[PDB]
Design a protein around this ligand. Sequence first.
Ligand SMILES: C[C@@H](Oc1ccc(Cl)cc1Cl)C(=O)O
Ligand SMILES: O=C(O)CCC(=O)C(=O)O
Ligand SMILES: O=C(O)CCC(=O)C(=O)O
Ligand SMILES: [Mn+2]
Ligand SMILES: [Mn+2]
Lengths: 289, 267
Amino acid sequence: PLSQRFERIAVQPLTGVLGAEITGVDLREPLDDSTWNEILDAFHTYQVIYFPGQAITNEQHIAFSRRFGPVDPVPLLKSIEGYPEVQMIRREANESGRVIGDDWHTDSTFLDAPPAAVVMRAIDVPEHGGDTGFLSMYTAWETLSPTMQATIEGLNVVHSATRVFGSLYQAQNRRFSNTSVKVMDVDAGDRETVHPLVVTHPGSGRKGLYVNQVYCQRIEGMTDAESKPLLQFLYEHATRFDFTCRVRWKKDQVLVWDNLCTMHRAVPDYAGKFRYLTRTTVGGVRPAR
Amino acid sequence: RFERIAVQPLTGVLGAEITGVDLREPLDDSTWNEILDAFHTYQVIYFPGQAITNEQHIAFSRRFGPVDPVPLLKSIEGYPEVQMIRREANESGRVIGDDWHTDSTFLDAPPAAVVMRAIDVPEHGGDTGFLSMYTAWETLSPTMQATIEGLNVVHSATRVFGSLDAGDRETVHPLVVTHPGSGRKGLYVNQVYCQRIEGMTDAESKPLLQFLYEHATRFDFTCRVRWKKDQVLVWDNLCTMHRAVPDYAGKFRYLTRTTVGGVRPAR
Ligand SMILES: C[C@@H](Oc1ccc(Cl)cc1Cl)C(=O)O
Ligand SMILES: O=C(O)CCC(=O)C(=O)O
Ligand SMILES: O=C(O)CCC(=O)C(=O)O
Ligand SMILES: [Mn+2]
Ligand SMILES: [Mn+2]
């Protein structure tokens, strides 16, 4: 049982698939080795973990994030004054632009080495509205038939940011506001990189599906017509409701998600209400089979 | 080659018109061999002006293999082997074969070929479409080819004459088959008889089969044959698909056909 396996923290799973609430620890302070190792174990098992009631400073947020790996801010988001490492998911009450992250994805997979994790901190969130969905790409992979696994396990996939800040974004109407999003070079938006469709997580050693509808363009080697259906099936499969969990925010909730083996999604159900979280990004290494 | 027959290809994909031969007569070795060469190359071949009897029709068909009638068609009186594709002028409803398919793939060994003979056909209307599954396979990307070449597909007749017992019987064929005569690889799927990719769930299988149906039936993989009375046509039932065209309402249309038996589709 969790109560006896964990001696320094308390772990309460959110679903039978992923997600867990962690209590019994003070993120204002340096973590001792035994406490950190339990958090890291829970992180690898539950893939998204969150800590209610952690009223921390920007420096403490950064220090906690550093336990997971080096900081490596994502390219698109603005930072707060004085802290380049601390980026903003901020939406003013009156804004009407596109909501950041409102499609299932994982972050910045157009990079040669996308983030390994993100540590998000709620600053000011609505009493209701603005939950975040998560899902497990371990589960998505593990629930494919043996025949479908054999069929796709050796494929590679082309990623780019073209629909977020490259040529395709610039040729359409739904735009982000300047509250949290920077102006970007279109050529950087169009730059392609190739990642495996199935990857091995370096911490857990487990295989997971690695495709997302925001940044994936096509299966490498295939035409668009050939790719379109396999990719669309995999998006529908991965985002099956029974592979998900739903996290509700409260002020001072600190959450870590695994940027390799989960996906996540914003929920734009709080029009007219201010919502502000900060986040630090933990750098990763090239996705690999 | 072609010293004994004259061959005029219809498109750059498949189909050819053959002249300079009299199908009422027995074919010598050199002439038969050229016809078979043209058949393997062009996949659908047709001979205008061949006013052949029922017996000559059967005899020509036997050069391709054993004459083994498809299960569901009516035979003309006196000749079990010779079956009817007949529609009356006063007839309404929909037409036999009005979806892209190839014949009877629910069988463990579907027909190898069909020899069709126009008896009474409209001045215009009632063309037959054909397409090449060699070309369909060869135009898939190398990556898609590698991705699906090891898949097998479950066929059954449930939607033609089954529930939707012999109509519910399943058989499994390779998704990509090697032609036993030409040695060439072709795609082997069709929307009439294919049920699912073996081993996959419905959600996994449906989009992939649907893409392959869309790909194979791309217009640029097709040809279109117009009929005239006394035209004799042979199609390869393994490496082509075909489709009737119901654009002749009010007009009588009558063709006969013999069916040539095949062997198990093989990788
Ligand atoms: C910050 C995040 O950027 C986005 C991801 C998905 C979507 Cl739909 C939009 C944005 Cl800005 C990222 O990918 O790093
Ligand atoms: O605002 C949220 O709930 C998630 C936004 C998001 O996708 C992100 O911060 O990367
Ligand atoms: O009538 C036609 O053009 C073709 C009908 C058909 O599919 C067949 O005879 O197998
Ligand atoms: Mn995101
Ligand atoms: Mn037919």
